[PDB]
Symmetry: C3
């Protein structure tokens, strides 16, 4: 027996009315595939003589080891897109433009414009607040070795005439000078001062000074010859006063020096010395002393003399000449 | 020949003791599948007449093109979770609250509390250090056009009586004024000064001033009539001094003006002029000059005269009256 | 019929020259697989009697639901690597070292070194610019309750003799003092001042002061006894002047006090009072007044008397003695 089977092209089977017997093999000549009958279905409705089931295969791949599009997408969704995020380097880039609290160098203007909680009072107020209580450095060090400039090192301005606080307040406790101004010896000379003050306020002194020294001056001024030449500073003075009219004014009645004791002093009110030797003075009682010959381009009104060293008045000379003239008239 | 094969349900085969001959086909009526004998194994242990091997299939999918769960997880693990990272926008958000070194506007308090390396000495110390050596702007510009306030523009306080540095130090080289205070003409008048100083320190002058002017005053004061009215400032003065007791004190012996030359001057110690014409002065020798008639509500003690323009003493008048009285007594 | 088929090992078939008839089954004894002839091809070139096509399988897996290596890689490439990005925490870390514009505490030096656009002029210049126009706090509050230190609270230095701006400029409008210095009562005494100024500038006054007070002093000084003891301050003075030579200098000709009216004043040029009672004064015309007995350790040159209270000259006494001597010589 060399057995052959009912056979024809797949597509020919497809429209054959032939019913294969149960288990009778039919062969598709162009595919080489077989099918067996079930006694009823036409060929195209039988299945193949052998399994076509993925789950009956051998050497299946590891399908469950594989990532699903869904699962992957869920996981990718938790990750940050490059686009929406700064790189470490772009981060340093930006942070390096920012001032460390630990310190740094400004190259531009630091403006302050306080919104103001209360902005406090005392040693916890101020837009800039510096406490050096645990340290040995300066607070604010401003300097310039530039040749010329358009602005000062520090400027304090108040705009409104009602302004009811100081521009600069110094409350000092310590052992050296509260405020110290050195204007050291020019090479190229200035026609100006270490401290210069102008006030146009007619109801207050330009400068007020109170002290309570045991044995010193409230203000001590010293002039020092700038030269070794004995008489070079001959037009200088420790204190110079001028008394002037207003521009286009009619003149002035202001006094030069006014000295008073509102509570009364027993001290010399004006005392003038050279080489620490009294030369002239006004005693607390307004009497005066002078050490050398003096001159008045005028007369002197004074009281009649009683002591021998008293200056004689004209009245006194005249009466003594007149007494002598009478007494001597003993032509009788 | 229409061939049929030993056949029965799969499950019936499953417990059949029938051994198919080698290559003899047996058919599973309910699955339509065939198996061939090997001459020994029962049906359930033969395999199907045709291959069930994934690797013999055609039109396999691209299994190796597919991502494995493991591989994907490795790669996802290198990526940043959204949660642990700032967005660009949240990054700008935070950086915009930080001060650019290039400049910016503070709206709150900048406190300093130095930890202090040494905090230096000179022009590289200070919590705030400003160098304007290459520029034409001011250093610290503080101003206020507010109507009233609770605090000054600048405040310097030192708390401890041992404190051995200044509150403000000015070391000036230049061609204009080191320190300049303008208190310009009030519309609403203040009863106060451009500069006001009080000291309760009994062992030091409230203010000390040294200069070495060739032809100027160490301190120059000018009073200017505030009015065009010739005599409006009649109670004003360039310099006003008061000398007072302590509250509930017994009084005072302080002098008004004290002038000395510790090294001896040949200059006039006090010189008083009007319209630049000497009117009164005390010479270096304590002698005085006065230009007009003067008055003493008292006597004057002086030396006997020798020149004709010398004031006569009482001694001198008396002796001349007495000499005349003797001489004339030639009643003999 | 129990049918058996031409059969032999796969590998034996592989090199058999046997041509199976069309649809004649041949069996591979070691694999259990069948093939059917096509009437021409050798065994090894027939295919199996049943389909080996992935696309004809049942229970296929969801291959298209699976992620491809390519697709996954594309998506991973848009995500940020952990390595190239800061964590939220590392971000806070860095930002917390930066100064909030809203405020913060510096612990190190803030240097300024302006690059300078123009650095302005007026109330919009300065490396540090503070405007308190809408607020009630101080601007710059510098203080120290430390015991001793190496640096002052504030320091202003200018290096170049050409420097053509001030160290400190105060432009004040308001109702209290522009600048106020309090050096309150020491427990441990300093040998120093509230304000101390030295200038070595021979061409400008160390301090200049101008005011225009209606009824006050341009400078008002008050000395206050520091003790209740009437005469404790007996060596004190409101104003103390010294006039000194240069070290190794030949001496000095500087004046003590110089008073002038460049425009001419009708006021008393020097006026000295005690308990507000005139005691001594120099009138605008250089004449003087004194209230008590005075002394000159010398002579007084003055004009011949004309009134009775005028001091007599020697000339005048002498002429009256001489007139009496003549007149009385009527021995004829």
């Amino acid at each position: 027996l060399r057995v052959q089977f009912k056979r024809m092209k797949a597509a020919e089977w497809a429209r054959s009315d032939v019913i294969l017997l149960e288990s009778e093999i039919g062969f598709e000549t162009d595919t080489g595939f077989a099918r067996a009958g079930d006694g009823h279905n036409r060929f195209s409705d039988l299945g193949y003589i052998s399994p076509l089931d993925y789950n009956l295969l051998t050497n299946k791949p590891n399908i469950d080891g594989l990532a699903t599009k869904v699962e992957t997408a869920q996981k990718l969704q938790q990750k940050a897109d490059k686009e929406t995020v700064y790189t470490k380097a772009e981060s340093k880039q930006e942070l390096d433009k920012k001032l460390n609290l630990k310190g740094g160098v400004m190259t531009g203007q630091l403006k302050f414009k306080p919104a103001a909680t209360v902005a406090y009072s005392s040693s916890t107020g101020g837009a800039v607040n510096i406490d050096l209580s645990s340290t040995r450095g300066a607070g604010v060090v401003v300097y310039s070795d530039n040749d010329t400039s358009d602005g000062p090192l520090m400027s304090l301005r108040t705009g409104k005439e009602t302004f009811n606080q100081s521009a600069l307040f110094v409350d000092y406790k310590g052992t050296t000078n509260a405020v110290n101004i050195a204007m050291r010896q020019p090479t190229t000379p200035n026609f100006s001062s270490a401290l210069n003050i102008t006030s146009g306020n007619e109801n207050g002194s330009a400068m007020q000074l109170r002290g309570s020294e045991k044995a010193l001056g409230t203000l001590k001024i010293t002039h020092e010859n700038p030269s070794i030449g004995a008489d070079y500073d001959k037009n200088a003075a420790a204190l110079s006063i001028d008394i002037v009219k207003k521009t286009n004014g009619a003149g002035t009645a202001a006094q030069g020096i006014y000295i008073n004791s509102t509570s009364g002093t027993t001290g010399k009110l004006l005392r003038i010395r050279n080489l620490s030797d009294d030369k002239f003075y006004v005693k607390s009682d307004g009497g005066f002393y002078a050490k050398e010959t003096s001159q008045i381009d005028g007369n002197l009104k004074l009281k009649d003399p009683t002591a021998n060293d008293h200056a004689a008045t004209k009245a006194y000379v005249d009466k003594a000449i007149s007494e002598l003239k009478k007494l001597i008239l003993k032509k009788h």
